[PDB]
Design a protein around this ligand. Structure first.
Ligand code: F3S
Ligand SMILES: [Zn+2]
Ligand SMILES: [Zn+2]
Lengths: 85, 121, 98, 254, 66, 58, 90, 176
């Protein structure tokens, strides 16, 4: 209840994912796939063999299990899942 | 819809370099000012022609003028007459008449419609 | 000043009715902001010099001949007075509208 | 239909009556590009004291055109191994000597430079030059030294009509399409029009200019390597070869 | 330096026309008529013949021994 | 300017506090709207929305 | 000349030809516009530095796009043969 | 990780709108504006062959549709050619850059096509200029289209439509 705009901001960013978090997820998944992690999506029927593209498609589908924990400045921590079952 | 015999008054030099405005007096106090280009100049002054504005595609000949466009800009003048502008994908046809097109429920706004003016012979 | 954007073959370049293709093509938009009228004047003067064969003197404040006589002589030799000329597109073969 | 206008030395002007503009443009482009002409490919320099460096001299020799009307059938095209040889071995004595293309001895007697007045290089005192050039057939697509035509033009067919007598039109038009005889404005060279529309611009009502849709004017100027008619025939043959190969590949793909 | 074999714009041989054009222009004839009757009508070739320097005449004195 | 302003960051509550913890603004730009995503200087151009909805029959 | 086929269908075809400049592409575009049934035919030079063209054909469905291209090639061959015959007698 | 961060954050199309002000930093240069204007003039008319040559450069395959002029001669208007690329729900009513002086009537009734009228993705009126597709121009038609349909659509529109503009200026003739 700091201000009305602060409340709007906080309720807006609960259900959405910022581009920094998307970039971090994609980079982490690409690094994992490069070392030898097995992709979750179907390897075949993909036009691009690049690891970055596979990680991006996995993020778009939502198969990869990643939970982002965002620490608010007042100590509150929010967990956002990417599974989207 | 909205077809009638008419006589063209003059062919103005036009605002642009290669555009001529054809002015036309029709029945029931209706006037039509439509833009043409040098190639689309099959018209001569004081000639009597017939125009049709129909949703369905009408018959036309090589000696006729046929086009299709989207009706828009329904406005009511302070006098009381209604002004409409049909855009033949850029070529403006300006209709001044009482009981305008959309007011009289003849056409809907933003509807594809063919405008065909044909010489009488 | 400017780098070479691309090298274009003789077939692709837009040829004129006499078949003369440009050696260098320059964007007209470079002219009005830079306000270099001397470039167009030199183009017309060079065309007149090649056609008539007579020397062209472009010394500032005193040029021989003047622009009007150069244009008249260019018209006399067989080209357009304003140094323009009919150009056909090399790739498609279609005459340009201007 | 094809109608000849004027057949000057190394120049040919034709009117094509029923041909699309795309085909005529392809003909002119293939005449510039897809017609093989013999020209210098490599140069072997035994000795060179000339002011011109080796690369400049090799380029000058390459730009020299050789007559190759009878060399098309006797020599393999580059897509196929048979190259002609030309020798140049001279030396000045005490005064500068401008050596021309006439003193270009060739292994094959039928293949000679187009003109002997072409100056290759100028040699100073006591300067010796000796080289052997290996001539090879090639298309204008690979290099411009192989182009058989100096210029090729395809332009619209003009239809110019005089409507009344106007004194200005004779001096407005850059071409001699208009003449003033017996105080009457007439057209002398209708086909010399270029559709400039100055004739229409200064006297709009006196003259009417239009273009004929089906007819076109095709002009080619050779450099002496080939006859203009042979250039056109070879361009059409190259177009036929390309179209036939494309059709074969399309049929194979199907 | 030395006149180019072919016109840069159109591949037309102008090297063989240097000697007649230069000799007749130096003789006292206006370049326009000489060019017209020599066989060059396109001004692209005329600028090739008109604007030439013939540096090669001076260079033969200062030639690299090699 | 870059050396002075480098430490600022946007946090999850809308504040513009620096990395050392010092708060600069309670809300960024008074509406938490980035200039990149704003329609010129406006967070929402209402007339633009009106156009988007009823422009065909305008 | 290499040939590659893209997005081939009954009425829509794309085809990349390697080794032909504007001349063959424009010739084929003209003949495709001449043959009946072709709704929209156009060639393109994706990059002038690379001598490879791409021809896109969309047909009304009466005739196949590949068949339309073959008919255009036949028309071009007929024109070339007629031109040769007419030049030889000149 | 560096490659992934470069792709997901610093890609060119994602940064079309500058952070300095809410306006597109990428847009039509000087030549693109002239080509778009000359293509969008009310007087332009294009035959089927010219339309095919214009649209060849773009990566657009589809039904051209009936030409805007059916008789006496089939002619496609430049606005009709342009409207094939606009999204089917896009409304704009801004003035053009040419309506910056005496010739401006400040209304959609001016005989001079200086008032851009687009309804349901159809360029019914007006011409494209610096105020329609120009760079560094906030609240322009291009800026609104990008803001409403994403930077990927923005990039697609830029590539195809601007190549079309350049091709038309090539085949018409622009000189000094
Ligand atoms: S040369 Fe010919 S056709 Fe027209 S304007 Fe000039 S006359
Ligand atoms: Zn020349
Ligand atoms: Zn106005």
């Amino acid at each position: 209840t700091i201000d009305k705009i602060n409340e709007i901001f906080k309720e807006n960013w609960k259900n959405k994912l910022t581009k920094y978090e998307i970039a971090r997820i994609i980079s982490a998944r690409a690094l994992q796939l490069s070392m030898g992690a097995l992709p979750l999506i179907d390897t075949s029927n993909l036009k691009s063999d690049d690891v970055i593209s596979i990680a991006e498609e996995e993020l778009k589908r939502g198969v990869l299990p990643i939970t982002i924990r965002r620490i608010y400045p007042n100590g509150q921590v929010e967990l956002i899942s990417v599974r989207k079952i | 819809m909205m077809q009638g015999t008419c006589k063209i008054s003059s062919i103005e030099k036009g605002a642009l370099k290669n555009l001529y405005v054809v002015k036309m007096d029709c029945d029931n106090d209706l006037k039509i000012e439509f833009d043409i280009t040098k190639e689309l100049s099959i018209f001569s002054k004081d000639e009597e022609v017939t125009f049709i504005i129909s949703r369905e595609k009408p018959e036309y000949s090589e000696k006729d003028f046929c086009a299709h466009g989207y009706l828009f800009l329904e406005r009511q003048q302070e006098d009381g007459s209604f002004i409409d502008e049909i855009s033949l994908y850029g070529l403006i046809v300006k209709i001044l008449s009482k009981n305008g097109l959309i007011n009289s429920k003849l056409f809907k706004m933003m509807d594809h419609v063919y405008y065909c003016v044909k010489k009488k012979a | 000043k400017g780098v070479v954007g691309i090298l274009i073959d003789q077939v692709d370049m837009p040829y004129t009715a006499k078949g003369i293709v440009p050696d260098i093509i320059l964007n007209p938009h470079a002219l009005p902001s830079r306000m270099t009228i001397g470039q167009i004047m030199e183009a017309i003067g060079g065309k007149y010099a090649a056609l008539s064969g007579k020397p062209v003197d472009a010394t500032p404040f005193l040029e021989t001949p003047k622009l009007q006589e150069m244009q008249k002589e260019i018209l006399k030799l067989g080209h357009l007075p304003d140094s323009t000329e009919v150009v056909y597109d090399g790739r498609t073969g279609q005459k340009l509208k201007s | 239909p094809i109608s000849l206008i004027e057949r000057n030395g190394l120049r040919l002007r034709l009117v094509l009556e029923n041909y699309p503009l795309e085909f005529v443009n392809s003909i002119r482009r293939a005449s510039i590009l897809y017609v093989p002409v013999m020209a210098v490919d490599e140069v072997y320099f035994i000795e060179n004291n000339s002011p011109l460096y080796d690369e400049i001299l090799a380029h000058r020799l390459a730009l020299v055109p050789f007559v190759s009307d009878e060399a098309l059938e006797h020599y393999r095209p580059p897509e196929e191994g048979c190259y002609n040889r030309v020798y140049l071995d001279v030396e000045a004595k005490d005064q500068p000597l401008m050596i021309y293309s006439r003193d270009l001895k060739s292994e094959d007697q039928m293949i000679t430079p187009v003109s002997g007045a072409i100056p290759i290089v100028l040699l100073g005192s006591k300067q010796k030059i000796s080289l052997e050039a290996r001539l090879r057939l090639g298309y204008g697509k690979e290099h411009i030294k192989y182009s058989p035509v100096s210029v090729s033009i395809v332009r619209y067919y003009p239809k110019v009509t005089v409507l009344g007598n106007c004194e200005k039109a004779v001096e407005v038009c850059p071409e001699g399409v208009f003449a003033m005889e017996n105080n009457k404005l007439v057209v002398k060279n209708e086909l010399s029009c270029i559709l400039c529309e100055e004739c229409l611009k200064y006297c709009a009502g006196s003259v009417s200019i239009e273009s004929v849709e089906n007819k076109f004017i095709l002009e080619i100027e050779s450099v002496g390597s080939l006859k203009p008619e042979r250039i056109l025939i070879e361009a059409s043959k190259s177009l036929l070869r390309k179209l036939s190969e494309l059709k074969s590949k399309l049929e194979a793909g199907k | 330096m030395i006149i180019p074999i072919r016109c840069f714009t159109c591949g037309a041989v102008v090297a063989d026309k240097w000697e007649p054009f230069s000799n007749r222009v130096m003789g006292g004839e206006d370049p326009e008529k000489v060019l017209t009757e020599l066989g060059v009508n396109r001004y692209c070739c005329r600028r090739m013949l008109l604007s030439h320097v013939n540096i090669i005449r001076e260079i033969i004195h200062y030639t690299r021994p090699i | 300017l870059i050396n002075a302003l480098s430490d600022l960051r946007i946090e999850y509550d809308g504040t513009v506090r620096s990395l050392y913890g010092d708060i600069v603004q309670v809300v960024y730009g008074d509406d938490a709207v980035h200039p990149m995503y704003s329609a010129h200087s406006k967070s929402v151009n209402v007339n633009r929305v009106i156009e988007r909805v009823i422009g065909w029959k305008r | 000349m290499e040939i590659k086929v893209i997005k081939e269908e009954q009425n829509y075809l794309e085809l990349q030809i390697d080794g032909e400049e504007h001349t063959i592409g424009n010739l084929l575009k003209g003949m495709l516009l001449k043959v009946p049934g072709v709704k929209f035919a156009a060639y393109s030079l994706p990059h002038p530095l690379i001598t490879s063209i791409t021809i896109k054909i969309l047909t009304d469905g009466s005739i196949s796009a590949r068949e339309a291209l073959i008919k255009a090639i036949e028309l071009a061959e007929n024109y070339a043969n007629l031109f040769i015959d007419e030049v030889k007698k000149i | 990780e560096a490659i992934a961060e470069a792709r997901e954050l610093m890609l060119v199309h994602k940064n079309i709108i500058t952070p300095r002000y809410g306006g597109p930093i990428i847009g039509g240069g000087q030549d693109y504006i002239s080509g778009a204007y000359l293509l969008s003039v009310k007087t332009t008319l294009l035959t089927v062959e010219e339309v095919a040559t214009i649209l060849g450069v773009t990566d657009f395959v589809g039904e051209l549709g009936e030409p805007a002029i059916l008789a006496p001669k089939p002619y496609y208007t430049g606005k009709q050619v342009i409207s094939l690329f606009l999204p089917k729900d896009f409304n704009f009513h801004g003035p053009a850059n040419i309506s910056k002086g005496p010739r401006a009537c400040k209304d959609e009734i001016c005989p001079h096509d200086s008032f851009i009228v687009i309804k349901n993705g159809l360029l019914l009126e007006g011409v494209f200029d610096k105020k329609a597709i120009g760079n560094q121009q906030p609240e322009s038609m291009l800026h609104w289209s990008i803001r409403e349909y994403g930077t990927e659509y923005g990039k697609w529109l830029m590539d195809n439509v601007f190549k079309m503009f350049i091709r038309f200026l090539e085949m018409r003739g622009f000189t000094m």
